[PDB]
């Protein structure tokens, strides 16, 4: 069959071009609902996750932007304290006490 132009036209019709766009930033992993849901499950449950995908996806950028919005319980102060001149133990204090 001989395809007509309308059966071949794919470009989105341009309607206005005299003004800039005002669009709110998209949520992290926009159009990537599987990855977003998997990372949400891994954050809710505290599991270790791994991100897989083709390169040039900006996976690291989106991952950092998504993790920056997380609110974890205030982590305790972990530090190294010398119990002697040879033995060094790990000390856990309330946050802001070290």
């Amino acid at each position: 069959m001989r395809l007509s132009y309308e059966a071949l036209e794919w470009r989105t019709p341009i309607e206005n071009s005299t003004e800039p766009v005002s669009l709110p930033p998209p949520p992290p992993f926009f159009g990537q609902e599987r990855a977003r849901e998997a990372l949400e499950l891994a954050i809710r449950g505290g599991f270790h996750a791994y991100l897989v995908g083709p390169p040039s996806l900006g996976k690291h950028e989106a991952l950092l932007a998504y993790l920056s919005t997380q609110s974890v319980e205030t982590p305790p102060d972990l530090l190294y304290v010398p119990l002697s001149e040879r033995k060094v133990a790990v000390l856990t204090l309330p946050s802001g006490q070290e």
């Binding site: 159009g31 998997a38 990372l39």
Partner: peptide, 11 residues
């Protein structure tokens, strides 16, 4: 690593 956050090559 039990959770796999797979990224689709397209949207």
């Amino acid at each position: 690593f039990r959770i796999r956050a797979e990224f689709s090559p397209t949207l």
